[PDB]
Amino acid sequence: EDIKVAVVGAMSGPVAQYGDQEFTGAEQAVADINAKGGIKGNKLQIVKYDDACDPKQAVAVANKVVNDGIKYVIGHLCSSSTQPASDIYEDEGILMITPAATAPELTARGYQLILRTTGLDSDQGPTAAKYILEKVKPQRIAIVHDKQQYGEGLARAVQDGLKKGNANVVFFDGITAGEKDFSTLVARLKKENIDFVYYGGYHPEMGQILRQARAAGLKTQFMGPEGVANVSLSNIAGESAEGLLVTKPKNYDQVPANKPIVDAIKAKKQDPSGAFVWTTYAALQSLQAGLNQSDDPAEIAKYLKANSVDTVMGPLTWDEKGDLKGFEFGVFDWHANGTATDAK
Ligand SMILES: CC[C@H](C)[C@H](N)C(=O)O
């Protein structure tokens, strides 16, 4: 009979866009897998859970998944939501594969049932720093973040890499997620003649910062991580998004072999351009490879760590703590278009 797989992410709230990408990828992977026969004739079925990328709700969802008897979780997306949920999953023998959480701490605590189909900010942060030091070469930098594990973690990593390269960081400070009035920020950037800003956070905040900065006549060059590289950023900022530098996973939707998946998704009037469509599809493929060997969570995790799995992201390989080996974030130019081109 049917095999239940929880797909957990932000299906509502300020960053619902992340959940949209996730579900789109999950839905297509499950349809593709079941069309080919499922797991030895057994069909896979997705059970959608909304954690709104809110830590307290992610904890409620984790407990509900356990109580619903589901043993495999594709998900949770935000780092600060994924980590407390992983504590429950590890304690309850539930396999958890996140297609989007990037904070290093998630996998630095000895957990055996946690894996990822995305990279680490201990790689994403230095990639940004290096690019700024080698290609951008700005004169007066400011680093802003939203005080959350993800954003503040990247902000600190970039600050450390810039300090190490003798860059002039004029200020480092956080703002509150949810904030829409960035007038004092814009004024400080203007007053202190800041030509470059790295923002560690998500698209709702980045979008407003960009609009207001441009409305105030600022020519400052901004840069942000993959949490900012999506169509919702472009919809919020409009023309203020052109010029934005971002670090993000490769454009898997442009890999020729993936075209059928792209066409199938477009065919449903869904967006196949978001990175989490692909990291999530890949997570389902990883779960598929393991379910073909065993239905036990620890055996699946052990199997995946000992064997590569071919996916829409290419062949994935994991280390003993559950991280992808050799994953790389690229640096791109984002456009009001909602598209990304490799930065020079
Ligand atoms: C959707 C994931 C977000 C963008 C970020 N990578 C995090 O770990 O919170």
From Swiss-Prot:
<keyword id="KW-1015">Disulfide bond</keyword>
<dbReference type="InterPro" id="IPR028082">
    <property type="entry name" value="Peripla_BP_I"/>
</dbReference>
<comment type="function">
    <text>This protein is a component of the leucine, isoleucine, valine, (threonine) transport system, which is one of the two periplasmic binding protein-dependent transport systems of the high-affinity transport of the branched-chain amino acids.</text>
</comment>
<comment type="similarity">
    <text>Belongs to the leucine-binding protein family.</text>
</comment>
<keyword id="KW-0574">Periplasm</keyword>
<dbReference type="GO" id="GO:0015820">
    <property type="term" value="P:L-leucine transport"/>
</dbReference>
<protein>
    <recommendedName>
        <fullName>Leu/Ile/Val-binding protein</fullName>
    </recommendedName>
</protein>
<dbReference type="GO" id="GO:0030288">
    <property type="term" value="C:outer membrane-bounded periplasmic space"/>
</dbReference>
<dbReference type="GO" id="GO:0055052">
    <property type="term" value="C:ATP-binding cassette (ABC) transporter complex, substrate-binding subunit-containing"/>
</dbReference>
<keyword id="KW-0732">Signal</keyword>
<dbReference type="GO" id="GO:0015803">
    <property type="term" value="P:branched-chain amino acid transport"/>
</dbReference>
<dbReference type="GO" id="GO:0016020">
    <property type="term" value="C:membrane"/>
</dbReference>
<keyword id="KW-0813">Transport</keyword>
<dbReference type="GO" id="GO:0015818">
    <property type="term" value="P:isoleucine transport"/>
</dbReference>
<dbReference type="Pfam" id="PF13458">
    <property type="entry name" value="Peripla_BP_6"/>
</dbReference>
<dbReference type="InterPro" id="IPR000709">
    <property type="entry name" value="Leu_Ile_Val-bd"/>
</dbReference>
<keyword id="KW-0029">Amino-acid transport</keyword>
<dbReference type="GO" id="GO:0015829">
    <property type="term" value="P:valine transport"/>
</dbReference>
<feature type="disulfide bond">
    <location>
        <begin position="53"/>
        <end position="78"/>
    </location>
</feature>
<dbReference type="InterPro" id="IPR028081">
    <property type="entry name" value="Leu-bd"/>
</dbReference>
